[PDB]
């Protein structure tokens, strides 16, 4: 009577052709494969984003353009005192490998790429100048162009540190210090060191003070290595050192 | 010394970048001052060779 | 044991039933009043 | 994360999931919501992005596994782009992105 | 000795059949209201 | 001997597909909302 | 010797589809909006 | 010391982030500041092979 | 001590809300304070190892 | 004692209310206090036995 035993073990088998186990290495190879399909051809490129000011002489070289293959490069128009300028007219050559999304009004333009290795030329109108503006472009470069902010020599038709110590931003060209006990982050740039924490100095005098919506505490300050902190009845005595 | 990096580069023409912001484009025989001549533009692998000897790539950091 | 085959066409649709209506699941349903 | 808007300020980058939101908001200095105005996108098949056109967050999927991807997007008050890159297929994903911004 | 390619090809069906599945993913539905 | 030729083949087709899949690039879409 | 013309061949139709692609060149476009 | 932690890691690339906050991208041949010259960038396992010894992963909070 | 219970259990990663509320998310190579390190994770029978062999469970009375 | 009664029985899951007016549903492996360990489920004629050899069933004139 085992006969229907048998039959239903081997229709089982017959049902579900493949093991679990090799299943789940078959999905394992599918996404290896789907991994290989979706390489990258070579190195990718380093994303770098750059100002320019242009040059509107006679006798000068019009610059060059990474393209990058369909992803977006955004160029903006800035003059020399970096007011906007939108442009009157714009056209470029072989429409096929560019893509471009102009807004009406904006100084700006964006720019998707379609080819691989095909090179191209790019002519402006400003919409205050008679001069116009020609730029060159070749694709498949190591360095590909996020976004260029491109200002003019010509002038347009139009002509903070505080914010950014409370958000976090420190000074370019600081250093971090060494508080014995205090939770603050001092950072000493320019021989008047900003700290950032949440106390309440009391000793030496702020000298420029910023407290925050969230209420936090920026200050700025002289060099000296000892300060006496009160904090809610309490007074310390804090060593700054580096 | 101005430097110069390779700004752009195709198979036949070069574009470097010097220190001062001066840029310019180089054939294969073409007069580089300081730098002579050029021997060799490579266009793959960004690497161009000099009549001094000298290679010129890209930035290290702009690579 | 040529019997083998028998018992396998008898169950095969069977087995090959319930599985869809296993398969068979419904949307819920949402009412309200006024 | 902070976004720096310094000319040479590396470039924002986001993990992805596929089938799976990404939540990304901008916000300003005081912590007030700034208003999306304008994006553009390429691939627009990789990626689905559902945007109330006055909002300010975007909700957006993957579409493939592994294939990375660039967006920009205009804000009101900036005459300048924003720029960021997402990648698919990491070991974390990025349920929220809160885009910290310097203006 | 015979019996693999048999056993390759309801395998393959099999396998084609799954194959279809991972490839394919939906959207997903943003919903408004008030 | 003729598996060579016969891997070749479907070899071949498969990297036409894939390939046929690599040529595709799409276009950049722009969205404005008020 | 004999495989030459089946090396011509080969040789022949992706030679003919190239000269296409030089030959292929569009136009100039210009757009303008206020 | 500054630690380093994987956040995105392509073939090819890689992004870390530094322990100030300071985040970037290295390659195979660049220079890391603090740990010298970048020996080897693994895309699977998580793997930043350094001249430095060090081989850095991802952070045990994001894993 | 803190006591974590699973509520999330897959291939790979496991949800545990400890007693003091938080909760966590882990994966094979993960580091708990009060237990140690992850040793294995079974995603049926509700079973997960650690480096101090207690077997990570559901909650008794909710499960 | 609060006198348990079988409210739903499935394979599974039990559904069992006591005297006190609570029920609880419940797994195969549960602890009931007051009557002990329930170590097996027959779905079939409503018998659940208990550690300490009492059955709870349905009530005799309310099932």
Same mark, same amino acid.
């Not at chain 1, 750059?50 to 006798?59: C, D, E």
């Not at chain 1, 914010?163 to 014995?180: M, N, T």
């Not at chain 3, 396998?8 to 949307?27: G, I, N, P, R, Y």
């Given at each position: 009577?085992?006969?229907?035993?048998?039959?239903?073990?081997?229709?089982?088998?017959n049902?579900?052709?493949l093991?679990?186990?090799?299943?789940?290495?078959?999905?394992?190879?599918?996404?290896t494969?789907e991994?290989?399909?979706?390489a990258?051809?070579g190195?990718?490129? %380093?994303?770098?984003?750059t100002?320019?000011?242009?040059?509107?002489?006679p006798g000068?070289t019009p610059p060059v353009?990474?393209?990058?293959?369909?992803?977006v490069?955004?160029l903006?128009?800035?003059?020399?005192?970096?007011?906007?300028?939108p442009?009157?007219?714009?056209?470029?050559?072989?429409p096929?490998?560019?893509?471009?999304?102009?807004d009406?009004?904006?100084?700006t333009?964006?720019?998707q790429?379609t080819?691989?290795?095909n090179?191209?030329?790019?002519?402006v109108?400003?919409?205050?100048?008679?001069?116009?503006?020609?730029?060159?472009?070749?694709?498949?470069? %190591?360095?590909?162009?996020?976004?260029v902010?491109?200002?003019?020599?010509?002038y347009?038709?139009?002509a903070?540190?505080?914010?950014?110590?409370l958000?976090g931003?420190?000074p370019?060209?600081?250093?971090?210090?060494?508080?014995?006990?205090?939770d603050?982050?001092?950072?000493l740039?320019?021989?008047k060191?900003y700290?950032?924490?949440?106390?309440?100095?009391?000793?030496?005098?702020?000298?420029a003070?910023?407290?925050?919506?969230?209420?936090?505490?920026?200050?700025?300050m002289? %060099?000296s290595?000892?300060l006496?902190?009160?904090?809610?009845? %309490?007074?310390?005595?804090?060593?700054?050192?580096? | 010394?101005?430097?110069?990096?390779?700004q #752009? $580069?195709?198979?036949?023409? #070069?574009?470097?970048?010097?220190?001062?912001?001066?840029?310019?484009? $180089?054939?294969?025989?073409?007069k580089?001052?300081?730098?002579?001549?050029?021997?060799?533009?490579?266009?793959?692998?960004?690497?161009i060779?000099?009549?001094?000897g000298? $290679?010129?790539?890209?930035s290290?950091?702009?690579? | 044991?040529?019997?083998i085959?028998?018992?396998?066409?008898?169950?095969?649709t069977?087995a090959?039933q319930?599985?869809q209506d296993?398969?068979?699941?419904?949307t819920?349903?949402?009412?309200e009043?006024?």
């Amino acid at each position: 009577e085992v006969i229907d035993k048998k039959a239903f073990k081997d229709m089982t088998r017959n049902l579900y052709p493949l093991n679990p186990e090799q299943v789940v290495k078959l999905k394992q190879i599918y996404e290896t494969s789907e991994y290989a399909k979706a390489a990258t051809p070579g190195t990718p490129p %380093k994303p770098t984003a750059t100002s320019q000011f242009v040059n509107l002489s006679p006798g000068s070289t019009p610059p060059v353009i990474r393209l990058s293959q369909g992803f977006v490069s955004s160029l903006v128009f800035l003059d020399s005192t970096g007011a906007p300028w939108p442009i009157a007219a714009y056209d470029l050559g072989d429409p096929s490998s560019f893509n471009i999304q102009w807004d009406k009004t904006s100084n700006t333009l964006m720019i998707q790429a379609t080819k691989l290795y095909n090179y191209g030329n790019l002519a402006v109108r400003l919409r205050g100048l008679n001069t116009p503006v020609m730029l060159t472009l070749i694709p498949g470069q %190591k360095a590909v162009d996020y976004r260029v902010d491109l200002r003019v020599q010509g002038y347009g038709p139009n002509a903070d540190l505080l914010l950014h110590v409370l958000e976090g931003v420190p000074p370019p060209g600081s250093r971090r210090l060494v508080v014995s006990g205090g939770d603050a982050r001092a950072w000493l740039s320019n021989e008047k060191m900003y700290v950032r924490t949440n106390l309440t100095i009391l000793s030496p005098g702020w000298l420029a003070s910023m407290t925050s919506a969230d209420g936090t505490h920026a200050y700025e300050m002289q %060099k000296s290595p000892v300060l006496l902190v009160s904090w809610h009845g %309490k007074v310390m005595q804090l060593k700054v050192e580096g | 010394r101005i430097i110069y990096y390779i700004q #752009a $580069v195709i198979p036949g023409r #070069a574009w470097l970048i010097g220190s001062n912001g001066s840029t310019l484009t $180089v054939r294969e025989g073409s007069k580089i001052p300081g730098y002579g001549m050029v021997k060799l533009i490579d266009s793959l692998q960004g690497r161009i060779l000099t009549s001094s000897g000298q $290679v010129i790539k890209f930035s290290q950091e702009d690579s | 044991q040529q019997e083998i085959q028998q018992r396998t066409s008898d169950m095969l649709t069977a087995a090959t039933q319930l599985v869809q209506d296993w398969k068979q699941v419904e949307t819920q349903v949402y009412t309200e009043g006024t």
